[PDB]
Structure formats: C-alpha cells, structure tokens
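## Example record

The block below lists the input lines for one assembly entry, exactly as stored, with component labels intact.
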Amino acid sequence: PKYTAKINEAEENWQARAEAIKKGKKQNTWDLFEERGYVKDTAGTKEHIAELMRTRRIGAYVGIDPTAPSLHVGHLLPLMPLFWMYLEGYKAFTLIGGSTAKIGDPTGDATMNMTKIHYQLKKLWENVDTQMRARGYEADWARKRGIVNNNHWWNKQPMLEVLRRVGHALRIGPMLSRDTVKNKMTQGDGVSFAEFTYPIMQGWDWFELFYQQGVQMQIGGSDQYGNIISGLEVVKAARESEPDPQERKYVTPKTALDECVGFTVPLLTDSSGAKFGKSAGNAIWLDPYQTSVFDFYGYFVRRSDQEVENLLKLFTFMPISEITKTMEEHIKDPSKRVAQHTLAREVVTLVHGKQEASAAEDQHRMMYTG
Amino acid sequence: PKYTAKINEAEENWQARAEAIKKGKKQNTWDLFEERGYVKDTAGTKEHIAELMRTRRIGAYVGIDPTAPSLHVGHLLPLMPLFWMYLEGYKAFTLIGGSTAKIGDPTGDATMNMTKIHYQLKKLWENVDTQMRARGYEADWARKRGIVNNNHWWNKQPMLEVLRRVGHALRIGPMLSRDTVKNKMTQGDGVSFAEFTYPIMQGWDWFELFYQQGVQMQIGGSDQYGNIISGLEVVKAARESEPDPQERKYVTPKTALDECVGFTVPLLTDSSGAKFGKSAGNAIWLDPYQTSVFDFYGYFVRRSDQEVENLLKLFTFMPISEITKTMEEHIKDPSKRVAQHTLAREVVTLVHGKQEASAAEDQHRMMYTG
Ligand SMILES: N[C@@H](Cc1ccc(O)cc1)C(=O)O
Ligand SMILES: N[C@@H](Cc1ccc(O)cc1)C(=O)O
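Predicted structure tokens for the full assembly:
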C-alpha cells in the first residue's frame, strides 16, 4: 500500500520530468554532464545513457578503494556527477571497497582506513545536502543517497557461486587484451591472480548494487574504463544466469533500457603535467588534519587562468550562467584571481563548510599569504 | 592419551619400515611405482618423493570430476598407485570434484552423476580391501582410505579468503604460459574465467586435504601435470599465508620434507593410437549396466602381446615375480592369450569380483566368443 503509493507518485513525477525534457523545458542530466565536462568514455552509447536518464529514476554509484585514511581532491571528480544526479533526484551511492582494497586495483591500518573513509564520505554527503538546499532543489521522497561497503557481500560470498554465475561468460582474452593487463605484465612486474580477478569482483559489486538498489549506472575515475567494460559483462552474465524463475522477473533484462551503463570522467592535469590534486609531492587531502583548510583553499586559488573555468564547471554546483558572469568579471583583471577565489570558495565550502571557507578567503586576502 | 599411543606405535612401525628400506630389506613404494611403470612426470624430484615416502606415512589423493554416471577403465590408472599406497599402509583418498565438475577441467544429471560415482568408488575401494587381504597384507591401524567430495568446502568457501590466501602469490603469466591455456585460446574457442580458475580451485582442494588429512601427495592423470604444478603453488601460498600463529605450527612448513609433492601417470595407447579404455566409439565402463562384465573382460583379453606385460604391471597387484612367470608361460604360445586372460581375470576381479571374473573367463573360453 503506502510505500507503493509513494513509489507511484515518484514515477509520475519522474514521467512529467521526462516529458518536460522531451519538450525542452528541462535539461536532461546527461546533457548537464556533457555541458559541465564530466564525460570522457561511455560504456553504452550517449543516446542510450541519455534516454535511460530521461525515462528512469536510476541508481548510480562510484566505488572508492580505501587505500589511505583520507580521500583527496582527485577523488572529488567522479563524485561530482554523482552528486549532480543526487541533487536531480536520482538514487546515488558511494561504495567503499573494503574487501577489494586488499586485492588492490592494478589499472596502470586497513580497517582504520575504512572507518575514516566512511566518516569522510558521510561528512561530504551532509555538505552535498547543504548545497542542495542552497542551490534551490526541492525535497523529493524518491531522491536517495547511501554509503555501502562491499565487505557486506565479500566477507562470505562463495567463490563457486561467482564462478557459476559469471565465470563461464567472461573470456580471459578480452581481460588479457586490455592495456593495464598487458602493461604491468610486459614492462613492470607481473599480474597476480588476485589482480586479474579484481575487475570481476568490482563487476559483482555492481551486480549486488543493481540487485539491492536498482543501480544501473557506474561512474568511474578516468582510468576505470576497462573495469567498467568488464563490470558490465559481469552484471549481464549474472542477470542472465539467475536460476530462479521468480527472481528473473525482477533481475533478467526484458527491454533495451533495462541494461546497465557507465562512463568515466576526464584525466585532469595542468599544462606542466601535474596530476590534479597533487601540489608538489603530496595530495591535497580532504582531512584538515592532513591538509589545513588554508592550504586546501591555497591549492585552488593557485589554479591557472587557462583551466579555471573548466574547474568551476567540474568542481562546483554553480549554474553555467553564474560561471559565465564570474569569468566575465575575472577577465577584467586576471591578477585579482576572482575566478580562482570563487573556485576555492566553492570547493572549500563543499568540503569544509561556508565558515571555514570565509576564514580561508580572508586569510588568502592578507598582504602576505605564503 | 589413546589415539596418541596408537599414533606413536604407528610412527614407530613406520620408522622400522623406513630403516628396513634404507638397509634394502624392504622396497620403497616409490621404487615400486617406478618398477611397475606408474611414473610419468614428477612435481618434486624423485629423490625428494622417495625420501618423503620412506620417512613419512603420508596421505595421497586422486581427484575425479564426475562428468558422467560411471567411471571407465581409464580412470583406473591414477587410482592404481594410490591403491598400492593404501595396501602399503599410507592414507589414500579419492576426491570427487562435485563442485569443480561444473566449471570443468580445460586441460587439452550432475547430482545423480555425483551419487553414482560415490557409489562406484565405495564399491571399488571394498574390492581393494578384498585384494589387500588376498595379497597377504596385514591389518594396520594407521592405514586409511577415504572418499571426499570437494563440495564439502566449495559450497560456502568465500572467494575473498581464497584470493587473500593464494591470489597474491600466483602470477597469471605461468598460468597463461602453459600449453592448455595457450592451446584452446589460440586454436579452439576461448578460455572462460571459470576455466582459467579451475587449477586454483583444484589447488585449494589439495590445501583442504593437506589441512584436514595430512595429504602431501597428489597423483594425477596423464594430462594433469600443469594442474599439479599450479596446485603446489596454491598449497604453498596457503600454508605460508596462514595468519594464526598457532595454526602455523601445524600448517606452515618447517623442514624440507614438509613440502607437498606430486606425479602423473603415463598416457596409455596401443600401437594404432587408440586411447586405453576406449573400444571403438565408447568407453569400457565400470558399471555392468553400461558395459557388461563379458564385454569388460573382452576388452582386456583383446590386449596386444606387445603391451600386455606393461598392463599386468599397471592394472594388477600381481608381484613382479608372478607377472614374470605368466609371461614365461605366455611366450610358449601367445595364441593361447594366457597373459591377456590373466590381465582380464585380474582387472575383472578388482572391478566386478572373483565370481564374475570366473564366469566371464568361462564364457571367453567357449568355442565362439564374438
Ligand atoms: N577500482 C576503483 C574503485 C572501485 C572499487 C570497487 C567498485 O565496486 C568500484 C570502484 C579505483 O581504484 O579507483
Ligand atoms: N582435474 C582432474 C580431476 C580433479 C579434480 C579435483 C581435484 O582436486 C583433483 C583432480 C581431471 O579432470 O582429470
């Protein structure tokens, strides 16, 4: 009865939204992704992903392996489109790779790390809510966010079941004919069986999130394209191999838009080759105990004129009109770092909050700042 | 106290045996293996395996994947040295690959198959006991036989634990640079992830048998050499990665003779290329409902003069002196098929029992036999 009525109202709301998009009254979140610059590679055509996003209140996820006690600003990039979807009323999850960090992604303390990353994600998600309220988005019952740790299934998930459900459908050649698996096996050491199996586990992760939460979309870091391709194979195998006739009603695809999709975000460097979120020989951590707020703000205020508009698009919830006005002010006199102070203000506001942001800005407008 | 006293007497008996071998009073079972022709390839040096067998009442196993409801005579070959060890007072196991049959060994109904194979192995093991008594071997408390199904661990064994315990130690290159994995991936279809993982599961099987039963030796079919090499890596990884300090006392090797070893049996064909145990386009099944006893006996009575001594050595418990006397009678007039009737009599006696054997011999000595 009553969850059902609410689900029905949600779908009806979603469908009026869908029609509004078809008529051009409302921008498709997919086209927002393209406009702001989040799309590098897609697993699924852009027409596919657009239409899935228009017609269905999907779930989406980003996975993070807790390889250290703090996230850094480089982690923010895949999270940003995820947060945009959340603001738009999708279901959005950050998956902590508690079990999968121990294998480690080859593309190219641990419990305490897992605890700290959960804490930090919860803190950031709360700042997203704050920003959602500040940017004028209305409450929506069907809007959902969550934090999931893949140890929830990996602690007991039988190997046999994974091999039976997906292992016969996945051929090792495509896994092997992929640049990471050819790279570190030619130049660099070898690939461990555990390393080789990592993409299969991440694919099973996606299956579990599809099954449990309706997650049809994975958003990946810039180097996650191969893992996403493999993950789709794993999820497809798993949905097709479901033995129970009753579960198949729910899990086996019937229609084209039932399929899963994904995309990756761009690789961000400056014109000197530096990786975004690295300032010298260290990360810009989200933890103030590791990187002071002043220094976090500093990182952003030092961004280049050449990259700053692109970074305002990626790392803020500023409407494009707002960014355009900022850039119009900024080019009057770039030496004033209007755009960079805006970027710093917005990103600090998201990670550390408005008060910390104001204080840091005041400090960076002193006559000496380092 | 009392299992302990019995274990101590067993070890003392084993050590008098060991000294008797060192002094040449008693043949090392390893040298029996060599004399009778069971040794093709060894994982571990022959000096290693010999000394392990002299000094330690090891456990050994043969794995069989239940891919059909009956075993056939080709299955007997790896079982024979295993049965010899049993007669000599080792611990000897036949492992049914209940879970691993579903993946299937790539080297180159299902529940009912598992039930029938268990039944047949139990029946054969009982005939081994009969033969043990008939060949003059004395009761030994420490002599042990068993039938184990790897579904005992595979039904619930977590993938994560397997990957953490062995997955980092096993490199995919050696797995990949092996002829089977290069064969069916070049010529022939692909290799499924499940296929590629099969040797890891069989290696974990061996670990479970080492842990549970003290099994240090695997005997393999003629094509199982690669699987045995991989299995040793898996068992070594697993014994070295045991996290508990108390378990390490028992599971982590301390000495050279603590290591696991294995060997394979020869590939048996006749001079026309036919696979041993194939008579035309069908197997010679151990099940009388599939291959009559008459026809089973017939298969053996038709063996060639060129191969019959070799087959008496492999497929019977006849002392070498007995086989020599048989061959001395046989060469007086080969047309009488003395040696072949002896081979038929002995193998039928093992699989179907002495009464069935006598009847089949009488039938094959009629003036018309097909
Ligand atoms: N493999 C990703 C993280 C990840 C982990 C688990 C997942 O299910 C998804 C993504 C990385 O290292 O960047
Ligand atoms: N792989 C072997 C059978 C086997 C199965 C499991 C084991 O643990 C050992 C051996 C075969 O097909 O001949």
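Strands of chain B lie at 42-43, 59-64, 91-96, 144-149, 215-220, 261-264. Chain B touches chain A through 34 residues (CB under 8 Å).
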